[PDB]
Amino acid sequence: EFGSFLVSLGTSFVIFVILMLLFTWLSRKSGNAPIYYPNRILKGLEPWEGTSLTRNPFAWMREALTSSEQDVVNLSGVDTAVHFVFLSTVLGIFACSSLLLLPTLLPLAATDNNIKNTKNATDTTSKGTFSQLDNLSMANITKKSSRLWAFLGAVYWISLVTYFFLWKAYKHVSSLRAQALMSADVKPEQFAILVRDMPAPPDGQTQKEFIDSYFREIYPETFYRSLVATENSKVNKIWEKLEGYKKKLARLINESVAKLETEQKAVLAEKQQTAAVVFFTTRVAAASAAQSLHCQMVDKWTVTEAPEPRQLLWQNLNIKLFSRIIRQYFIYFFVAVTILFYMIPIAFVSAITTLKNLQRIIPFIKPVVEITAIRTVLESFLPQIALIVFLAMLPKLLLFLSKAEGIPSQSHAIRAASGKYFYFSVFNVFIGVTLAGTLFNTVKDIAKNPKLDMIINLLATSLPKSATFFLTYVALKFFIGYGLELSRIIPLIIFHLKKKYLCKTEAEVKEAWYPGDLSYATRVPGDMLILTITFCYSVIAPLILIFGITYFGLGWLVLRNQALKVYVPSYESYGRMWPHIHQRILAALFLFQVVMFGYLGAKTFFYTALVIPLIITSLIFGYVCRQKFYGGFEHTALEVACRELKQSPDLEEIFRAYIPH
Amino acid sequence: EFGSFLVSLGTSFVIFVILMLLFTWLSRKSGNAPIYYPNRILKGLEPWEGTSLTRNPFAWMREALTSSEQDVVNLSGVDTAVHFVFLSTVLGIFACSSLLLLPTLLPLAATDNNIKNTKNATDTTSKGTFSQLDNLSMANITKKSSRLWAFLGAVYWISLVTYFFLWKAYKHVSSLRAQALMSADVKPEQFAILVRDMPAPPDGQTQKEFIDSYFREIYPETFYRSLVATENSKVNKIWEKLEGYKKKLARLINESVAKLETEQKAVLAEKQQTAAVVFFTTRVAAASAAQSLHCQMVDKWTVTEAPEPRQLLWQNLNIKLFSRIIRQYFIYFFVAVTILFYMIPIAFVSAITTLKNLQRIIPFIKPVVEITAIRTVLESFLPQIALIVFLAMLPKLLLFLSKAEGIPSQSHAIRAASGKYFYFSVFNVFIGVTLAGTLFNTVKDIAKNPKLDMIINLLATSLPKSATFFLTYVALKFFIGYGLELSRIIPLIIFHLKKKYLCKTEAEVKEAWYPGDLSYATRVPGDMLILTITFCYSVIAPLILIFGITYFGLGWLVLRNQALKVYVPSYESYGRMWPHIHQRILAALFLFQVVMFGYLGAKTFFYTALVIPLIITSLIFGYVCRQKFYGGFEHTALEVACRELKQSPDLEEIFRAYIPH
């Protein structure tokens, strides 16, 4: 496989060179401003700096490297800042860990020869099977070791560093959240409530008046209005989407309006059911109402904090708690079945990966055709591309599933997608590649011989070989992905094709060049894969830390110049993602700990019980942390909803902001 | 051991007869009213019914069996009612389960002879080892069974019944809580808040004024007062306790008052630190303040719901969150070490239990002197008494530990004691007795023979023998304990000794006859032991269900006539125990499921995987339930703090109720 690693890494450098070189040329062209420098045009701030020259080649860099933390916050938001905090803390963990671990352990994993001793009993036909593997706590560390002590103390170094960083971070994100919250404006969200599970109207009372009185009693000076309506039904949601389509085509009529009106009225003709956004009067009242159980026997009047208008997911605002729980259960069962099918395809990937040691067993002579040329390529671009493809259809499905539970707020739904993706990822990817490699290699060597004093050694061999494969994958990703992102070559092609053969109006060009968000449902989930792989295989094969620094490090560079210069944020959750990210980073430390308790044992290190203490510490850190911080990342404090509102918060305008269409 | 079971059960019937006969005599004597019929005197309602006759012997029964659910609520409270709900739901589960399970499985566990086949290979010297064991899915069900199907379908019957009952219950307790809450009075608790983690005063501001402004801003029309003071210090707590001692002796002075004043002032002379009970004005405001995070970055201003004055645990009101977490961790580690030491003593108990099969191992001829007489008694009263003793020093320690965490409110502290006791109990007791018996019996026989096709069978044998021992224990308990309770012979002796040789005043007699609470920190924890034992060993040995009905059933009889006629409630948590009880009952169903997945497997029932589905259902039921109900058992709803307050809630009186001394 060394030949193949060399190809993949090599080729990817070629692509990064060509794509990044393209960037340094296509950006200078001012006619490409709408796809290289947006978020500087939409928010009128001039395509780039004062035109002047052509911006010394390395200019994007200077800007990014000297962009103030606060500058990101003001320009983009307090969500971009949190993503950047994520990237940075991971980077740091990796950095320090790397330093120490790397030097020590790399010099200590070549100064042994368990691979060569294993090679004394490699039978025949299975000769060439390693190379470069001899540089990673692999099959090259003799069982009873006296050197494995260093590969346990390492677990401590990574772990302790993970703790310092995650704590320091939670604090820093919290500071950001508050600061931002205490420095905002009116905002149509700081005055609402979202009741979602209301009981039925009584005798012949109108739904509106029912809600009206209830809230007007508890708070008899702050109730203002109440927008129920079920948003003219979701069938009208669709009809208005179609009316938008029609006006776009202008840039059916009568009968279509008829349809809309009729369906909407006929559905409201009995009950608009639950879901209203009781708009309060002053903010403190709305804030207090938010964090307060309005009824015991939790199944009636569930009051949340009311999402901003842009993310209220009016579709699933109804539900009824019974249905919500049924949906939760079914959705979780489906994600588990999907984890199993993906295990199937990932086994497929690792198989495609070890080509020599496949023919030797599974298909014998069926694929022995494999020469040398085809071999290298089919195990240097194919296996990797497969993983990308499979784990790319996931983000979409996961969101669709999560948004079918009932979660109001797109923010929480994106967070749930991220979570289900973490599960998938972890389990599938890691376990799969690792175990399958091992099995494959150690299946025709475990078939002939039984016993046990050698089987464990062979299984460890194979664990480090799967490590080398994941390394090449991470590399590929990093290079090509960041290349494409900085070049935005895909979007460039699209825009400069539309603005040449498809754009009819100037508004059309405007529509075409609108950038998008940082897609926090494909960025963070995907970056979590890299986190887990580079955490687990950090001591078992310490080279996926020198590839890991690069991924997350190029992150803070590429993505910064893709946030102060292109992606314009969609929603704003004032930092409400860190809790999720923190739990996941800590769960990687935990999976890593469980695996570095297993592997250390297979390589017979009787004192491997000294990793159990850490398996506990992680779990304690978890609860201690949540208790101290999660609270603040949940609600808007009363001390933020009591700040001076100079201009009397004009209501009615606020009421008209949550108005459906 | 059958001989011994016969003795223990037999003897305990003797004691119950003698103690219950004593009750039916000593109660009629009117001079014993202060210890047989209190809570009818304190709350002036006449010792018993209209004196008239001597109350037909079985009178206590009629009263108890016809005491209205609401009558318990009004007379005692909405905590006694919840304990009674507990007893009743457990009773019911057991009842139905019993019915079915019992008939079927008992007729199906004697119609086989795995004990006799095991006896074909019982070597020598280890002959008599069973008897009556042949009536409990024991060593008398042949491995591959075709009869074990019934002992799996049984797991389902118990499980499904557990679910129906626990759901039905949560609902019913909730209804009780609310009803009671919407029908109370002013109460000095419905107008307070308990801030506990306040930041320091600013420049030279006084602690009081700091709190004052903060709350007076957020709520500028509801802040009334604020009682900080650290209650003149806890050293003064002790000094006032001593002043009480002095007035009791009256029924040192100057220098003692000096001490008090001095220490108190010197400690307040810097800062009264945190902990105030900001008293609001109207109830809705206090209620809203309760369930609201007053500050992000949870480490400042932690506002609870304010315990009633009688349970505010002023001692640990201070703390500071950092210290609270340190304490939590240390306390949990200590409970784990205590679990280990108790494992030591419980192994001791099961050992004392199997006397014959002890000589053959541990001490050979050291105790072989055992004859037949001594044998029966030393394994019929001794082992059992030991367990009682050990598991009685636990309640006290556990409370002391829990109240050292920091928990404000004695109610929650009693709940935490209960919880730690559950852990202890479960683990220790069950595992211990079971495993130790097994080991002991199956250690002499496992040492010599090897294979494995017989070892599992022998281990199962021993599991059912430990079952017989637990049966006798539960019986003993039930009989003697309830006997003592109804006779209150221990308290009678004490009172009629004080009122004859120790009482100086009439107030002294009053003090002596004050009953007490239902001790919900020794009742519920202890009854949970019986629950777990009778759940786990419900299919493995279906006879501990016919002993189980009795324990909990005599409960609703004995304890009712010990709540409408003696124990006067101390605090009132309006039902806030059910959440704890529910989780624990469900955890027994879970332990039972895990054990009936193990045992069914050891008795080789390849399709034992059909218990895994249930191991999942339990866990789902858990989260579904908590979500739907726990909320209501947490706060006082705003719709309860908005009910008509006819008489203007006199404040100042309320402020003077939380006044320290």
Curated annotation (Swiss-Prot), chains A, B:
It is found in: Membrane. It comes from the Eukaryota. Residues 25-84, 170-323, 405-413, 495-519, 560-577 are cytoplasmic. The keyword Cell cycle does not apply. Changing residue 584 to E: Induces a closed conformation. Residues 1-3, 108-146, 351-376, 438-462, 540, 602-606 are extracellular. Its main location: membrane. Acts as a hyperosmolarity-gated non-selective cation channel that permeates Ca(2+) ions. Mechanosensitive ion channel that converts mechanical stimuli into a flow of ions: activated in response to membrane stretch. Not activated in response to membrane poke. Homodimer. This is Hyperosmolality-gated Ca2+ permeable channel 3.1. It comes from Arabidopsis thaliana (Mouse-ear cress).
